[PDB]
Write a protein that binds this ligand. Sequence first.
Ligand SMILES: CC(C)[C@H](NC(=O)Cc1c[nH]c2ccccc12)C(=O)O
Ligand SMILES: CC(C)[C@H](NC(=O)Cc1c[nH]c2ccccc12)C(=O)O
Ligand SMILES: *Cc1c(COP(=O)(O)O)cnc(C)c1O
Ligand SMILES: *Cc1c(COP(=O)(O)O)cnc(C)c1O
Lengths: 253, 253, 380, 380
Amino acid sequence: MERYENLFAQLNDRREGAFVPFVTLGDPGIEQSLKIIDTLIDAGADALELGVPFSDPLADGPTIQNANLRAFAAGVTPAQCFEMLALIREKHPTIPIGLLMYANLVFNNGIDAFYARCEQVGVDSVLVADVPVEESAPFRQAALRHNIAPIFICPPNADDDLLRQVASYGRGYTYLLSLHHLIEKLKEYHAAPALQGFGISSPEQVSAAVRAGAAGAISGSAIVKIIEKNLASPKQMLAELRSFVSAMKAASR
Amino acid sequence: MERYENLFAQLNDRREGAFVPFVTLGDPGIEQSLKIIDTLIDAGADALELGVPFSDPLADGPTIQNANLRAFAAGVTPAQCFEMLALIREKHPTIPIGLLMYANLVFNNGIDAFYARCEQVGVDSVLVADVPVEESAPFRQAALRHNIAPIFICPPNADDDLLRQVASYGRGYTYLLSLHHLIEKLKEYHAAPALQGFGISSPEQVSAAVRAGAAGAISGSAIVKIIEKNLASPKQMLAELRSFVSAMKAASR
Amino acid sequence: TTLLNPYFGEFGGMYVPQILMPALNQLEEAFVSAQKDPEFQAQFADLLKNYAGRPTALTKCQNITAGTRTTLYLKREDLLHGGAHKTNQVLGQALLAKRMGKSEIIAETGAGQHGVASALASALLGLKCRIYMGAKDVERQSPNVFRMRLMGAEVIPVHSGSATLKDACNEALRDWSGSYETAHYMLGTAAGPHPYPTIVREFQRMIGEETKAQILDKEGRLPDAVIACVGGGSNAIGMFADFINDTSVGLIGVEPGGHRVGIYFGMKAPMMQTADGQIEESYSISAGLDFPSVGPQHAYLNSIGRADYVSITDDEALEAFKTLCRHEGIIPALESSHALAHALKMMREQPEKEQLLVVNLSGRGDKDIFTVHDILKARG
Amino acid sequence: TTLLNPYFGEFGGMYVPQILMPALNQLEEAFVSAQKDPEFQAQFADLLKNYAGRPTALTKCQNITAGTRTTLYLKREDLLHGGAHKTNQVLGQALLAKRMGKSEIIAETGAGQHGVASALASALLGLKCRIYMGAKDVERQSPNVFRMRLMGAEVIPVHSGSATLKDACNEALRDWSGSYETAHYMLGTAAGPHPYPTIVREFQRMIGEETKAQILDKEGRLPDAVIACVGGGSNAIGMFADFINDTSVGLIGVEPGGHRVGIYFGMKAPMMQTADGQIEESYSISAGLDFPSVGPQHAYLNSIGRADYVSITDDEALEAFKTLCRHEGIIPALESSHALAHALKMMREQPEKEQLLVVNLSGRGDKDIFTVHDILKARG
Ligand SMILES: CC(C)[C@H](NC(=O)Cc1c[nH]c2ccccc12)C(=O)O
Ligand SMILES: CC(C)[C@H](NC(=O)Cc1c[nH]c2ccccc12)C(=O)O
Ligand SMILES: *Cc1c(COP(=O)(O)O)cnc(C)c1O
Ligand SMILES: *Cc1c(COP(=O)(O)O)cnc(C)c1O
């Protein structure tokens, strides 16, 4: 599978960027999560980024923090997370699916084995947020043996040596953490297409990202706040996601 | 005045010992205390030993401890104590009256002046319980300038040097703390006649004291327990003191 | 890259997000500098000695060993300023914070002991101090919170999540990711990402150093064994380090017995965790030994045989606590009472073996008197 | 007779009943012996150093004196085993008890601090310990009572009288009058009948001794003044004694200001008392300074000019308490905070006078945190 390459070649044919929403799998319940995700895609999401509930998300803040809670409360295991992944793929054959994970869950039953399970359910990439590039060898190696793209975060405090490693080791996309120059350098080293993430919550910010050279934008707190705010009116919540996604995606032209 | 000499010369003429009760002045009230004392004398007491309520009676135990309490509660000052002393004398011209005191009260308004006040109300002796013989000079000197007999305790743990000082410095009587040999030594040095005190509560003990050579016995806890036990039946309390005193005094023959 | 190896065999590493790598590289570089700067040495020395009260006493305990062939000494870290060994390393980390021109300390704390330590070090060195603490731990540790604030620290009660250390600790990292130019993250034990297991050991190593000179002066030989309690492992590594190369000296680590390898807290180490991999919480009568994991240097020393690690239960710990107060007049911290309980079992299970034992008495137990009182009275 | 003069000028003496004179003569004779016995010296030394943690630190306090011309050092008795200077003299008295072949210690205690000290000393030396305490003081000092009993002491709550120290103390004397052959009465301060004011001073005098060597090493000259708080006067006499013959050294005693000569507690001394002569009770935020009187050696030193005695109020004491925690990270006992408050007024009232000051920090303030908390919250 080569789903990131194909989505970017396509969007370039249309001079468009990617709009990629993030949610926490199983929030606020297994079945409502599936409907939310399907709504995102239907509204125009180009790829998905998904999280798995984890006891210590040290790279995360509050709207998000509260989604994990709602997740552990409804009784979601990792196992249920993978069945969900499996059916999301069975429903949508070409959309790239990306996971955002922490290290202990990938290490628990064997690194090799976590990436075998992702490949079996049809996951396209995994970003391990608390694994810096300097320590990423066994994860990148595992990922690639199972056809999974290993993702790296390129920080704002990146220096040259860092971009070069990031370019050299990531595949599918680069995670550009909230920039123009960093974007040029990435392209100069032939890095995977950059997606800008953190803080994207309005159409003007997606356009600004495409205009700067990013191949697209990842929106996670904004989505998740729409879910928080709307826990008691599933219908409206879905209606809200749909207008939001549709507009963010329009701003990617 | 020479009231101790006279009482002992007399009792010797009758081959008798002295029986000397002790109470706390003002217990359980000023006026009831006066009636108690008068009852003691009427029942046959040969001399009196009196205490003045003091905030820290370190040479004292419980029945006694509780008499001081009852004393401070009824509102007794030292001043009231001396007026009482004065009227006790005005009522009984020959009975020796002895005080048992602690040092801070004798030192407070002037040593000299405390012994002037005792001589003015007709007190015959003062024992300062927390003043050892080694430190007694200013108290003995004061006492004697005002015609007051300074009293010393001769302990059971007395050695020779001690008896000699006691003999040499006390006047009126010696306080023999609860013994035959100590009694002989005292007489051999011509000490003031010994009265045995502490623990005297039955007729056989007064006889035993006289037989051993003591010139008499001091009874304080036994008296005071009769008062404690009888706080609500003044009549009976007085009746009890009278039988008790009378019997103790009979045992002094 | 780094200047020093971040791993002890297979354990250890720097498992943090990329954004905190420059802060770890900066600290490692500064510590490496300071270790070679006489002036930094002289300055750490001055604090130790004239402020914290080092060297500390090594006391013999004949009333406890009478009738056996053991001789027991206790290394008296309970007489350090502050009542525990933590004061050593927070002093060294506060001086490093200053060498890197930092003006602010961030910390996290469970029962409050590290929080008080970090606060007294910051007050002395003129640093601002912000301490993170789970709100549940905050309601139950009123004295310690108040001691932090008297010392000028801001204590931030953390209300999200389970509102326990987890969450306090995750919030501290996120503050350090935006403020690392001016704030130093003061970790409280010999665990976490490199370079901390290293830093912490070398800031606690005067313990075993002192103990080694003291024992040589008093007995003319090294101990048969050195015994220390282990939560994250700082007092123990600090007692063990100078003896590692003395192969005849036994090194015993004592973990809480109360009633598997993973990657967490920035390090690869053995961990208390579920089937699915979510980190659990360890439980002990003594809140100071509740650490789901253990420093990577201890994991290494076990893998190779150089040190053994044993456990002691709550009741055995309480028994040693009672024994020391009654026979020595020393009230020990319940963490250090697990260590002493192990040396008492060694003595009592083999009363005619000749053995010279040193126990690290990591801290005083005044702070445990209510815990112990409440236990004694719930059982009669 | 006695071997040593029982009076300091006019103050002092042995105002006890005759029956306790042989017990005082025996103690004086034994102390006089021990002071000339190398082996007793070596033994007291060994306890001090390897058990209690002497010498203690002398710390400078630049964060407090910044901007003035004062340099302030604190003598760190709060780092002694036990958290206060009392541990020094209870160790010396426990060893004397053993030289006289006593097997039992009797003591009295108000808030419990002397009681804990006497208990830890007895546990170490193998002495039985009975501690008298007023029942009202017993209900309010639960932690300290419990610390006594953990240490094997019997605490006897005294129910008669006002059920306060008075009464505890009078009961202790009466027990000592029947058991002096086998029990030693361990007085808690430099007051009472001879020979105690003397004993206590020479068992606390390593304080000023150490301070004198330390200050000579660090500054090259003696202090302009040494400042100590006074309840019965033991920490202060122990800091002042080695400097008495150094006439340029100012000696300042600090008594509690809270919001006449008499004979009591076995001694002739200035006392707090009524019109009629009944001893009153002194009041202070700090229970440790409530002593109706003061040791005879302090009374003497004042009469002749050699030392001055001043007062500090509760609020001034609380302010110095806050200042030390915030600027030095040291939490001081509220008794010693009266002493530091006086040195802060000397500094602040005359900020350009050059003065080298040493304050005796007699003990740590962990034990006062509830008192201080309850005050802060009753006033906002
Ligand atoms: C939720 C979404 C991913 C973005 N959060 C982050 O970019 C920062 C962050 C926190 N933890 C991370 C793990 C992986 C990638 C980015 C992460 C957001 O929408 O604010
Ligand atoms: C009450 C009477 C005096 C006797 N008490 C004492 O002898 C002992 C004692 C305690 N305090 C004393 C002061 C003076 C003399 C004797 C004293 C008694 O009857 O038990
Ligand atoms: C903090 C603490 C501990 C445990 O932590 P470590 O890092 O293992 O040493 C043990 N004892 C005391 C007294 C403590 O304060
Ligand atoms: C006991 C105590 C005191 C007061 O008693 P002194 O005999 O005057 O020294 C002062 N400070 C502390 C900390 C105490 O424990």
